[PDB]
Structure 1
Amino acid sequence: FLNHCYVDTEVEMKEIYTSNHMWKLFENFLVDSVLEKYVTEIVMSIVTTFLQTRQPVFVQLLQGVFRVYHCNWLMPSQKASVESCIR
């Protein structure tokens, strides 16, 4: 839904995106192809001007090995995580 609403997430006027943003990110990191979907959502979401959520993205790096899921996507996720850490 929200990944499909990423085309709606690139609107010119972002008014409810500032309030709902910073709330739906941490709920997405509650438990974690599901991992791939989570990675895509994480990639879509940049850090707003307001972090401590970077420890669960390393769970994606820690869960990148020791699993049948490959790291082409995992590598992209790691890069995204690095960018988030920089931000």
Structure 2
Amino acid sequence: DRASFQTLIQMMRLFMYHIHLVELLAVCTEGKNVYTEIKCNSLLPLDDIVRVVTHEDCIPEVKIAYINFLNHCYVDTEVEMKEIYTSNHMWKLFENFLVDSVLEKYVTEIVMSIVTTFLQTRQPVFVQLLQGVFRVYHCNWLMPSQKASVESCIR
């Protein structure tokens, strides 16, 4: 809230685990109704916008994706919106459907999180092409992945 950095040394290479737990809690269930409204209230505290804005509280090892659960407030979407889904819809919305953890996250969140398509508007498509290009992983974005990235760029 005001003291968002209880971690050091990339969360012990501990703090990272706590951050991960918060992210997991956010993933839990989210956004829409009465229970969804309670989740939305938690989301309001998070300010999806605040979360997008911040990461200087600590330095984790593989804990950079403790806020990737921003694709569960699309059910009873009007209710989710009523709770507040637009409070982080500038950074967190731009990261969900951005290309067409974060490389694989755009293809499912573009097909799961109800957002718009994301010239001077084409960076997501360029990012998708780069994702398709990588070969250091265990076949992460093959030809199909590249095609998906191209589709995202076209969107």
Q: Give the TM-score taking structure 1 as reference length.
A: 0.42
- State the shift of 1:61 in Å: 1.8
- Aligned residue number for residue 41 of structure 1: 109
- State the shift of 1:59 in Å: 1.3
- In structure 2, runs of 5+ residues without a counterpart are 1-68
- State the shift of 1:58 in Å: 2.2
SS in 1 for 2:82: coil
Bigger Cα displacement from structure 2, 60-69 vs 7-16 = 7-16
Residues 14 and 2 of structure 1: is their aligned pair in 2 closer, same or farther, counting only changes over 3 Å?
same
Report which of the two structures shows the higher radius of gyration computed on alpha carbons: 2
Give RMSD over aligned pairs: 5.1
Identical aligned residues as a percent: 100
- In structure 1, runs of 5+ residues without a counterpart are none
SS in 2 for 1:13: helix
Greater RCO structure (CA 8 Å; 6+ sep) = 1
Residues 76 and 44 of structure 1: is their aligned pair in 2 closer, same or farther, counting only changes over 3 Å?
farther
CA contact (8 A) 2:132 2:147 kept: no
CA contact (8 A) 1:64 1:74 kept: yes
Residues 50 and 15 of structure 1: is their aligned pair in 2 closer, same or farther, counting only changes over 3 Å?
farther
Q: Give the TM-score taking structure 2 as reference length.
A: 0.31
CA contact (8 A) 2:122 2:153 kept: yes
Residues 14 and 5 of structure 1: is their aligned pair in 2 closer, same or farther, counting only changes over 3 Å?
same
SS in 1 for 2:147: helix
CA contact (8 A) 1:46 1:84 kept: no
Bigger Cα displacement from structure 2, 53-62 vs 25-34 = 25-34
